[PDB]
Design a protein around this ligand. Structure first.
Ligand code: ANP
Length: 369
């Protein structure tokens, strides 16, 4: 006769944080509502377990933490605190304290509520302002999806979950539904256009919330749900399949970017087909709206609409705030680099320095230098 309210049990955090309840979960973390006595505010606390088993996963959480700690924007979720581990040399857990948000787009999409088109617009624009800041800081998030676009009741969007981000120069559930084809196809280089693609996918799901497109909330679906999310060739073949089913086999101009012969030949062996007509799928929105949607979802990363053009797109004139597009921020420097293979030792050092940024007096063990 166990109590389900024993989900709070595993969460051990300094006494100034009062754990209230569970709010959300992903493939890596469970996150909890908590009240902070010292700051007088609600916060979110992400707990990540088993964090040195796999070192690729370890690096992931370091990247998430180091990025958010060096970002300063109302459109990116704030890093409120990092809790000192009790065992500084052998800790396998980490408590990440974040600015709280009311919700997230994945939750909204499941709720039995309908949005107006102004809502859709307000939200997409807010998302794009966030992506702009990510760009101007010389980062590509690389894994934008409904789960990591947090939402507040006033329609403001806060981006999170930067563990897959890259800089501009075990087994888990893995969602490939918002991945750009170039990424699916594993091409050498890529730009922020990768985040615009993801934005297009999200936009389709924002469009689903209008009653005139979908009368019954039960039946809102992602645009590209091809890949299976549970544990390279087959998963990506299905994800590439469904993308072509929607936007079409690509034309020759789109294939000129590609470097490797075998990839072109892989592509070319998907039977030629035309897209769906998205105007017919989303037939309550203007031709401008559909233009914005179709521009974000171009196979050609080069022809895909840019952040700046999406912000200034006529479909969003009604909500645009050119005042907020113009800000000044520098390219952040991360305390490690993408290529760097790093030891447990070295990764524990960098964690503790970040934790030290929030806790001035923390002393890093000599063993970890
Ligand atoms: N600051 C926050 N405020 C409120 N809810 C949050 C916050 N951060 C995360 N959540 C909720 O927790 C979920 C998981 O967060 P996320 O950062 O994706 O965890 P993760 O497992 O570490 N990353 P992923 O596996 O890519 O989802 C989100 O989809 C939200 O429902």
């Amino acid at each position: 006769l166990y109590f389900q309210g024993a989900i709070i049990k595993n969460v051990k955090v300094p006494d100034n944080y009062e754990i209230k309840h569970l709010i959300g979960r992903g493939s890596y973390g469970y996150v909890y509502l908590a009240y902070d006595k010292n700051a007088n505010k609600n916060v979110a606390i992400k707990k990540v377990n088993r964090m040195f088993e796999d070192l690729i996963d370890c690096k992931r959480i370091l990247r998430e933490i180091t990025i958010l700690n060096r970002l300063k924007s109302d459109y990116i979720i704030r890093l409120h605190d990092l809790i000192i581990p009790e065992d500084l040399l052998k800790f396998d857990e980490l408590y990440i304290v974040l600015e709280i948000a009311d919700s997230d787009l994945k939750k909204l999409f499941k709720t039995p509520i309908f949005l107006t088109e102004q809502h859709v617009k307000t939200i997409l624009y807010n998302l794009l302002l966030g992506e702009k800041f990510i760009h101007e800081s010389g980062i590509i998030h690389r894994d934008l999806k409904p789960a990591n676009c947090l939402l507040n009741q006033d329609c403001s969007v806060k981006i999170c979950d930067f563990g897959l981000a890259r800089t501009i120069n075990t087994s888990h559930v893995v969602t490939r539904w918002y991945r750009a084809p170039e990424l699916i196809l594993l091409q050498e280089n890529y730009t922020n256009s990768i985040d615009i693609w993801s934005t297009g996918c999200i936009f389709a799901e924002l469009l689903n919330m209008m009653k005139s497109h979908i009368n019954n909330p039960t039946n809102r679906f992602p645009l590209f749900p091809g890949s299976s999310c549970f544990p390279h060739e087959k998963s990506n073949r299905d994800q590439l399949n469904i993308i072509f089913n929607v936007i079409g086999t690509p034309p020759e101009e789109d294939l000129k970017c590609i470097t490797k012969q075998e990839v072109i030949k892989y592509i070319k062996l998907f039977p030629t087909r035309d897209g769906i007509d998205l105007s017919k799928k989303y037939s309550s929105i203007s031709k401008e709206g559909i233009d914005l949607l179709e521009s974000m979802l171009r196979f050609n990363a080069q022809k895909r609409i840019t952040i700046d053009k999406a912000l200034s797109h006529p479909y969003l004139k009604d909500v645009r705030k050119e005042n907020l597009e113009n800000f000044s921020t520098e390219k952040i420097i991360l305390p490690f680099d993408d290529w760097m293979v790093l030891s447990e030792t070295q990764l524990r050092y960098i964690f503790l320095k970040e934790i030290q940024s929030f806790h001035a007096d923390l002393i890093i063990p000599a063993k970890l230098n």
